């Protein structure tokens, strides 16, 4: 289906972002990385008090927290491209807290964070993204 290809596109964006965050060596993706990184930096400083007290011990606990935060962020019924950027900024925050405190480090299984991020974006914001220009004409033209 079209949703399969749409899912893979978003998954690649989320993977790229995580590789950018960890500095592990496309246009839309580069634009996303630039804006999400400055979102993430601001968020990490505004939330030091909160975040210093958050344990991200596994991919499972990262997922639970991601899902709870996503539910609260979007419960007012508003989707926009700026909020979509914050999903990526937040996954970047989860990936840092995870490997900061992960006891047996595993970078490959961070595919898994990218996957549940893509699942959220696709199932909850995917139809909005389509009605709002897609990544290539909605997102890029706005944030480039």
């Amino acid at each position: 289906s079209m949703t399969d290809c749409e899912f893979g596109y978003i998954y690649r964006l989320a993977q790229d972002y995580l590789q950018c965050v960890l500095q592990i060596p496309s246009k839309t993706s580069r634009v996303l990385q630039n804006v999400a990184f400055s979102v993430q930096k601001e968020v990490e400083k505004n939330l030091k008090s909160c975040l210093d007290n958050v344990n991200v011990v596994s991919v499972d606990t990262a997922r639970t927290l991601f899902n709870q935060v996503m539910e609260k962020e979007f419960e007012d019924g508003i989707i926009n491209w700026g909020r979509i950027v914050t999903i990526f900024a937040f996954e970047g925050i989860l990936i840092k807290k995870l490997l900061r405190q992960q006891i047996a480090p595993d970078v490959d299984t961070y595919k898994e964070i990218s996957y549940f991020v893509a699942e959220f974006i696709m199932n909850n914001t995917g139809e909005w993204i389509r009605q709002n220009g897609g990544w290539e004409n909605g997102f890029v033209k706005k944030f480039e």
Binding site: V39, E42, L47, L51, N53, V69, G82, A89
Partner: peptide, 25 residues
């Protein structure tokens, strides 16, 4: 107890909406 879901969601929502206003086209 602390509800980090609320503290984080609140900040992401705020900055998401600001950034939404700061970029256009």
């Amino acid at each position: 107890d602390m509800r980090p879901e609320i503290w984080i969601a609140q900040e992401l929502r705020r900055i998401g909406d600001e950034f939404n206003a700061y970029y256009a086209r």
